[PDB]
Design a binder for this molecule. Structure first.
Ligand SMILES: Nc1nc2c(ncn2[C@@H]2O[C@H](COP(=O)(O)OP(=O)(O)OP(=O)(O)O)[C@@H](O)[C@H]2O)c(=O)[nH]1
Ligand SMILES: Nc1nc2c(ncn2[C@@H]2O[C@H](COP(=O)(O)OP(=O)(O)OP(=O)(O)O)[C@@H](O)[C@H]2O)c(=O)[nH]1
Ligand SMILES: [Mg+2]
Ligand SMILES: [Mg+2]
Lengths: 177, 36, 36, 177
């Protein structure tokens, strides 16, 4: 039997080291690993959730953040229906670069792709370099939803993916009617 | 046996992880040949 | 625990088998878009 | 580190039910399963062997035999460097169709692809419908190597793949010199 009613392709982008893989690892398998293993180009996970009584299969593509992998990762933008833009609240440079990642989306993804900004590692309060207020303001400047997350402490990871998936489904359902 | 079941599942995971790694590379290359 | 290790390896295999199945479908489709 | 010195793409083709998946399952994991699970389009296994002191990575594509999957499986012929053509010694129809599978190779694969015919299920002596002599003669008519195999009893499975891989390597080494 076919195990889903909707299939949404999701992408995680952002600088190397911000926690894209750890965020996905928490979402897809409810686990966290402190040992950094930088992603070689691309990684892939599946999770099927329920929304409005419907089975939503999420095919989630975890891109590498390093510029050396630009050619490979850029080719995954085309089909994406939702994109998480991830920075590290302890790394102001990763936050500054969110504007450049948005431009990368606008050059290579669909014009109407759903977007969300995640300020990750919010459990590391003692090393925060970007206030939550600044993250909210950047998101507001772009009209993009925003959430701070912790893969390690499991904060807002579920909320982030469920919210992005709900926004894709809402758009798709409006296109049907 | 449960340890023979454990080692056979451990070896399965390694093999599937290796196949996944190759398939991901194959996907990335096919997508690049397409964007041409 | 070894049974908790066994069940976690069993669940890993299922997930990897599911990802492999999807990637194989993705490979087949990309190859068909290319032969166009 | 890179784990191989050569990489050979292999394909298994032949009618549904002849034992392509079981032959590969024996080769790649040294196991046999009697319960038929027909392949949905394509399956994939890796094994790295040694030849001439060199590490030979075999990426092996197990095609579905049913005609409904023709479109999908035909697209895998292009890159193949070696192809196993498999029939069932207990099924004369699968043997008759080897000529049509050869034509499929010649229409869609490289002209110089390495080829090998396997008469599988040779352990089922009591139900043989195709003599070994007839299999040898068909192969001889086409100038293609031939072996009878048993995935179940592990007969000539190693020999088949090692021989095909040796033929690819020999050709490639001659192209270098
Ligand atoms: N304390 C804390 N550490 C985290 C969190 N998320 C990720 N990390 C750590 O940050 C490091 C980088 O995490 P990754 O998920 O591998 O980074 P990435 O964005 O996938 O990096 P690339 O694959 O190179 O693009 C890892 O060592 C994690 O342990 C978090 O929420 N809290
Ligand atoms: N006795 C015996 N049975 C075999 C042998 N090889 C395969 N079988 C049986 O034949 C049936 C078909 O085997 P498969 O490998 O699944 O057939 P296939 O060629 O992959 O078929 P498709 O995937 O539909 O193309 C299975 O039930 C196996 O148990 C063998 O060497 N000896
Ligand atoms: Mg990563
Ligand atoms: Mg099969």
């Amino acid at each position: 039997a076919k195990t889903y009613d909707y299939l949404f392709k999701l992408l995680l982008i952002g600088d190397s080291g911000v926690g894209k893989t750890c965020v996905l690892f928490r979402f897809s398998e409810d686990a966290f690993n402190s040992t950094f293993i930088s992603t070689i180009g691309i990684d892939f996970k599946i999770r099927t959730i329920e929304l409005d009584g419907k089975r939503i299969k999420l095919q989630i593509w975890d891109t590498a953040g390093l510029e050396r992998f630009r050619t490979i990762t850029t080719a995954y933008y085309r089909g994406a229906m939702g994109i998480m833009l991830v920075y590290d609240i302890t790394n102001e440079k990763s936050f500054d670069n969110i504007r450049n990642w948005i431009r990368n989306i606008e050059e290579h993804a669909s014009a109407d792709v759903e977007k969300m900004i995640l300020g990750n590692k919010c459990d590391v309060n003692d090393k925060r370099q970007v206030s939550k207020e600044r993250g909210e303001k950047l998101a507001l400047d772009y009209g993009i939803k925003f959430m701070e997350t912790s893969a390690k402490a499991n904060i807002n990871v579920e909320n982030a993916f469920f919210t992005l998936a709900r926004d894709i489904k809402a758009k798709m359902d409006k296109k049907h009617h | 046996g449960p340890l023979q079941e454990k080692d056979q599942l451990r070896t399965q995971v390694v093999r599937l992880q290796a196949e996944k790694a190759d398939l991901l590379g194959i996907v990335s290359e096919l997508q690049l040949k397409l964007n041409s």
